[PDB]
């Protein structure tokens, strides 16, 4: 894990900048 996240909805891979998942659009927390 270097400095990211996963979706909790789609599985998809993001930044750790980053606020929610550009490709669903939900939030990394709901
Ligand atoms: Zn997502």
């Known amino acids: 894990k270097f ?8 599985c998809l ?3 750790r900048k980053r606020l929610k998942c550009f ?3 939900a939030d990394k927390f709901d």
Do not use: P, S, T
């Open 3 to 10: 400095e990211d996240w996963l979706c909790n909805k789609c």
């Open 13 to 15: 891979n993001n930044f």
């Open 23 to 25: 490709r669903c659009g």
